[PDB]
Amino acid sequence: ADTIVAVELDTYPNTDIGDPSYPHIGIDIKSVRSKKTAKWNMQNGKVGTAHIIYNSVDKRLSAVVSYPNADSATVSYDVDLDNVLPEWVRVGLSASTGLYKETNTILSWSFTSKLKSNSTHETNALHFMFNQFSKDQKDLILQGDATTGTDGNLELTRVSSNGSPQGSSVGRALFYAPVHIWESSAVVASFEATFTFLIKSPDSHPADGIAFFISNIDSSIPSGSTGRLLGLFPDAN
Amino acid sequence: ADTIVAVELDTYPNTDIGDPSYPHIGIDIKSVRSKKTAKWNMQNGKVGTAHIIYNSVDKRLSAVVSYPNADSATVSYDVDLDNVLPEWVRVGLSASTGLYKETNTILSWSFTSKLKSNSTHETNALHFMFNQFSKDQKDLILQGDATTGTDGNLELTRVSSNGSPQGSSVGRALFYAPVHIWESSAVVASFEATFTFLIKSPDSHPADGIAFFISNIDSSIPSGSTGRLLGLFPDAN
Amino acid sequence: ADTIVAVELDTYPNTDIGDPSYPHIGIDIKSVRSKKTAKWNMQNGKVGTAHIIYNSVDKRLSAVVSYPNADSATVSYDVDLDNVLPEWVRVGLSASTGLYKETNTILSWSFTSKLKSNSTHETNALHFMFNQFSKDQKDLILQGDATTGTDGNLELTRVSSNGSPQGSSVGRALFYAPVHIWESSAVVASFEATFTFLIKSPDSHPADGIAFFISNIDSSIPSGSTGRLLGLFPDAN
Amino acid sequence: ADTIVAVELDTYPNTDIGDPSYPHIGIDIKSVRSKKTAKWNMQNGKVGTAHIIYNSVDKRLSAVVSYPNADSATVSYDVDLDNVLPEWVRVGLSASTGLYKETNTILSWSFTSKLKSNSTHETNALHFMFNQFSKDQKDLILQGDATTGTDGNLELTRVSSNGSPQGSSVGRALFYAPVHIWESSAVVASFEATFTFLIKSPDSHPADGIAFFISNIDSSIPSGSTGRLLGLFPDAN
Amino acid sequence: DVFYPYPYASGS
Amino acid sequence: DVFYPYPYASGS
Amino acid sequence: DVFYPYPYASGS
Amino acid sequence: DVFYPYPYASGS
Ligand SMILES: [Ca+2]
Ligand SMILES: [Ca+2]
Ligand SMILES: [Ca+2]
Ligand SMILES: [Ca+2]
Ligand SMILES: [Mn+2]
Ligand SMILES: [Mn+2]
Ligand SMILES: [Mn+2]
Ligand SMILES: [Mn+2]
C-alpha cells in the first residue's frame, strides 16, 4: 500500500471526481477527493509561493498559496498524522498533465522537521533548502518525467525542447533521506515546507496541478495516476 | 496602556479571580482571566519544558508543557494576533510569588519569529537561543527582581542567598530588540518559543507561576502586579 | 574613540592614505589603512553579494565579494578578535560619498553568531535576516543619512527622488540588540554575515564605498568621517 | 579505494605509524598518518564536545576538542577540499578497538552544510541534528559493529550487557543523504559539525579512537581497518 | 511570454 | 533536594 | 539602467 | 563511574 497525505494545487476542475467548479488548493488524506478545499486565484505565467505548516499541539495542517501583491488562498484541516502515517516517511513534490497541459516548474524548495522528545532538550531536526537545482542532484530521487538542471529548476513534468508543456506526463521528486515525522514520546513535533512554482499554460485551460506530499518510504508512481490523479493515486476513490 | 498576550504556567488556584481548582496552563489575551486553560501536573523540583507555537494560517496559539517521561498538558486557542497587538512587539518571560513562594528558574530560552511578505522569498526572521546566562547579559532587559548569573540561569524572582524562594517578588526578562510579530502584506507569519524551567517550593503549596508573554515595546511591571497577577497585569479584570 | 573592525568594499582609490591604485576589498583593524587588500572588479550597476566569516579556532577573518557569472575577490587576515574587540559589540553597515558619489543600496542582510561554551553544548546563538526593510524598521539603529522603506531597501547614503546619488554623505545601520562576540570559557566562537548591494554611479566615477563593521555598543559616526573615511574612522591614521 | 578526510581523536599512540607519543587529535588527508596533530588531554569517563569547521574562503579545516572546566585542544590544516574530495560525498563517524578497548559512545551529533552559488543567494543548505538515537534510525547507515537505541546513544563499537567495551571492533555511521560539499561556480562553501562523546575505559588503557569523516558516497569499512586504523584506511601508508 | 493570463484580476 | 514532590504520580 | 561607469565590469 | 584510566584528566 502507498500512504499519502498531500496538499494539492489543483488547476483543473474534474467535477467527475468531486472537484469544485474552480482552480483550488486542497488537503488530501489517502484520497484524491480532498477533505477540505479553498478557491485559488491561479495566475498563468506568474511565479507563486506555497507554505505548508503543521504542529502536533494543534494537530492542524494548514497551507497558504499566494502570488506577489495579490490575493492569497488558505486551507486548514484538523488531523492527527500519528494515526495516518508511519513514523518514518519521505517527503516530496508531485505533478502532472493530461488532456490539457501546463509547466510544473519548481524554482526553489525547502523543508524543516523537528522532533522534541520527552526529555531535556532531546530535539532532533532535519533541514534542507534548495534554491538552485544541479543537473545531477544526488540527494533527490527523481521518479517519472521529473528532471533537474533546466535554468537551475526542477521541471516535474515533460517540457518540450522549445519550452512548451507536454500532455500525459507525470513526475515526482522526493528528498533522499527518510524523515522521522512523528514519535510516541514526542512532546512537540512539527514541520513546515516552502516552495516557489511557475505554472505556464499555452492552451485554454491548464491542468492538472502540483502537490506537496508525504508518503511511505518506498512510495512510487501508481499506474494511470497520470492527469487528474496528480501522480499520487491509483484510482479516484 | 500595556498590551499583553501571555501563556501562563499558573501554579496556584486563585478561584477568587476565575482560576480552576488546580495548577494549570492557560492562554491570556489582555487579561489575567484566561480565555482557555488546561490542567497541568506540576512537579515540584523537576526540570520542565515549555513550547509555544503560532502561525498566521491557522491563527491558532498552542502551548505544550511537559516533564521527562511524564504526562504533558496542552492548551490551544484560536486568535488573530493582528487584531490584538501592534506589529512591533517585545517578547519576554515573567514570574512572581506572593503569600506563598517558589523558585522561578529559567534554565534555557530560545525564540524564533519569521515573516514571509507577499513577494518572492522576502522572508525576514529573527532567532536567539540562550542555554547559558552570563552575569552581565547585555542583550536582555531585566525588570524587577530578575537576575542572571546564578549557575548560568535566569532567576526571575528573588532567591535567597542560601537558595530558598522569597515571597512578594516580581521579575521579568525581555529580549532587547523589538520583534516584528506581524505585517499587513504577510503571506505567512509565525513564531515558536521554548524554555526549560525549574520550580522548587519549600512550603505546602507553591505560587504563583511563570509566563511567556508578548507586549508593547515600552511595557513595564504594573504596580501591585505581584503575586496572583503574574507581574503582567495591574488588576484582575 | 571607537574600536572598529571592518571589511570594506572600497570603490575609490585614495593612494594618499594607502589605497591600492584600484577598487579593492580589505580588512581594517582600527584604521582605514587596511591590513590586507585584494583587487576587486567592481561592476557598476550590478547586484553583488558579500560573505564575511570568522571562527576562533582558525582566528582568521575572511570575506568574498562576487557578482553573478563574474569572478570572486577574496581576502583574509589572521586576527584574534578577543584582543581587538570587547566581548559585547554591535554590528552593522556603513558607507559614504565625498566629491564623487554612488548609490550604496542594501537589498538584503543576514547575520549569525554562535557561542559554544566550555561546558559542552552551552550554545548560545543570534540570527537575523533582512530581505525587506520597512519605513519604520524598529530593530535597526539608523545613524547619519541612512534610511529604509525605499522599494524595501536600505539606502546608507543620500539619494534624491530622481534616484541619483549625492556627494558628501555618511550613513550607517546597526542591529538594535548588542552581540556577545566572544567569551573566555568558549571552545568555539563563530559568526558569518551576508548582504547584497547595488552600487550605482551615473557620473561614472563611484566613491567611496560600503563596509560591514563591528564596534563597541555605543559607536556613532565620527566627525568628518565622510567620503574616504567610510564613516568608520575620525582620521586616516 | 576510498577518498577519506577525517579529524581523529586518537586515544592510543602507535609510534610505529607516526603517532605522537601521547593522546592527540589530528587531521588525516587520505592517510592514517595525520598531516597535523595536537596533544590532547583525553579525560577518561567524561563527556566531551568536538567542533569541526571549514569554509572555502580560508580553505582551512579546523577542529577543537574540549571537556567542561578543562582545556581545549586545537588543530588546523590548510587544504582545498576541491582537489581532495569529489563534489558529492557522505559524512559520518567511525571508531575502533584492537588489543585495548574503550567505549566509543556518541551522545549527540549535528552537522550543517551551505553553498552560496555565484549567482547571489543561490544558497542551498543541509542540516541535521541528533540528540536521541532510536533503535531503528532509518536516516543513518550503520556499518560494522555500530548500533543505536542504547539509552538513546550510538555505540560505534562492541559493548557487552555489563556495559564494558570489546577488543578488535570496527563500526561507523553515515548520514543517509549524499552531501554536495563543493561546486565550481561557488562563492563560499562551508560546513560545521559537532558531536558529544563518552570514551570510557575500565581496563584503564583506552584505544583506539573516534573520528569524523568525509568520504565518497559508497564508502565501506576496509579489511582489517580495525584497531589503530580507525576503520578509515586499509593500510598505515 | 505568459505573464498573468488568468481569471478576473485587478488591472493588468 | 526537592525532586518530584507533587500530586498523584506513578511510582517515585 | 547603468553601464560600466568606471570599475571594470567583467562581461556586460 | 570511571577514574583517569590512563589519559591525563585535568582536574578530577
Ligand atoms: Ca483536478
Ligand atoms: Ca494563580
Ligand atoms: Ca577609498
Ligand atoms: Ca592510534
Ligand atoms: Mn481537487
Ligand atoms: Mn490562571
Ligand atoms: Mn581602501
Ligand atoms: Mn594518530
Contact present, C144 and C171 (Cβ < 8 Å) = yes
Chains meeting D at 3+ CB pairs closer than 8 A? A, C, H
The count of other CB atoms within 10 Å of the CB of residue A150 is 13
Ligand 3 centre and the CA of C54: distance in Å?
24
Instruction: Measure D12 CA to ligand 4 centroid, in angstroms.
Output: 4
Question: What's the full length of chain H, in residues?
Answer: 12
Q: The domain that contains D174 carries what CATH number?
A: 2.60.120.200
CA dist B122 and C148 (Å) reads: 15
Q: Which cell numbers in the block locate residue H3? A: 577514574
How many other CB atoms are found less than 10 A from the CB of residue B174? 24
What is the DSSP code string of B40-98?
A: ----TT-EEEEEEEEETTTTEEEEEEE-TTS-EEEEEEE--GGGTS-SEEEEEEEEEES
Q: For B227, phi and psi rounded to 5 degrees?
A: 65, -120
Contact assessment for residue C7 and residue C52, using Cβ atoms and an 8 Å cutoff: yes
Phi, then psi, of C221 in degrees rounded to 5: -55, 120
Q: What is the DSSP letter of A98?
A: S
Cell readout for E7 is 481569471
Q: Decide if B180 contacts B88 (C-beta within 8 A).
A: yes
Instruction: List the grid coordinates of D91.
Output: 559524512
What is the Cα–Cα distance from D108 to A124, expressed in whole angstroms?
Answer: 10
**For chain A, how many structural domains are there in total?**
1
Within 10 angstroms of residue C1's Cβ, the number of other Cβ atoms is: 10
Q: How far apart are CA D92 and CA D114, in angstroms?
A: 17
Contact A200/E4, CB-based, under 8 Å? no
Q: Which residues contact A101 (CB under 8 A, 6 or more apart)?
A: A157, A164, A165, A166, A167, A169, A201, A202, A203, A206, A207
Touch of A by G (3+ CB pairs closer than 8 Å): no
Residue H6 CA: distances (Å) to CA of D44, D46, D65, H3 = 7, 13, 18, 9
Report DSSP state, residue D84: H
**How far apart (Å, rounded) are the C-alpha atoms in residues B221 and B231?**
6
Quote the minimal CA–CA distance from G1 to chain C in Å: 7
Contact C187 D72 (CB under 8 A): yes
Q: Which residue has the cell 506568474?
A: A46
Query: Which chain D residues touch C67 with a CB distance below 8 Å?
Result: 120
Q: What is the 3-state secondary structure (H, E, C) of B99-155?
A: CCCCCCEEEEEEEEEEEEECCCCCEEEEEEEECCCCCCCCCEEEEECCEECHHHCEE
Residue C91, all three cell numbers:
554590528
- SS in 3 state form for chain C? CCCEEEEEEECCCCHHHCCCCCCEEEEEECCCCCCEEEECCCCCCCEEEEEEEEECCCCEEEEEEECCCCCEEEEEEECCHHHHCCCEEEEEEEEEECCCCCEEEEEEEEEEEEEEECCCCEEEEEEEEECCCCCCCCCEEEEECCEEEECCEEECCCECCCCCECCCEEEEEEECCCEECCCCCEEEEEEEEEEEEEEECCCCCCCCEEEEEEEECCCCCCCCCCHHHCCCCCCCC
Note whether C81 and D81 are within 8 A (CB): no
Task: Sort out which chain E residues have CB atoms less than 8 A from A70's CB and list them.
Answer: 9
Chains C and F are in contact, defined as 3 or more C-beta pairs closer than 8 angstroms: no
Q: Which domain holds residue A47?
A: 1-237
Q: Which residues of C touch D (CB under 8 A)?
A: 47-49, 51, 53, 55, 57-58, 60, 62-64, 66-70, 72, 74, 76, 108, 116, 118-121, 187-188, 190, 192, 194, 196
* CA within 13 Å, CB half, A24: 19
B194-224 as b/e: b if 16+ CB within 10 A: bbbbbbbbbeeebbbbbbbbbbbeebebbee
Of D62, D145, D64, D51, the residue nearest D105 (C-alpha): D145
Compute the C-alpha angle D135/C121/H4, nearest 5°: 80
- Side-chain half-sphere CA neighbours of A63 within 13 A: 27
List beta partners, residue C97. Answer: C169
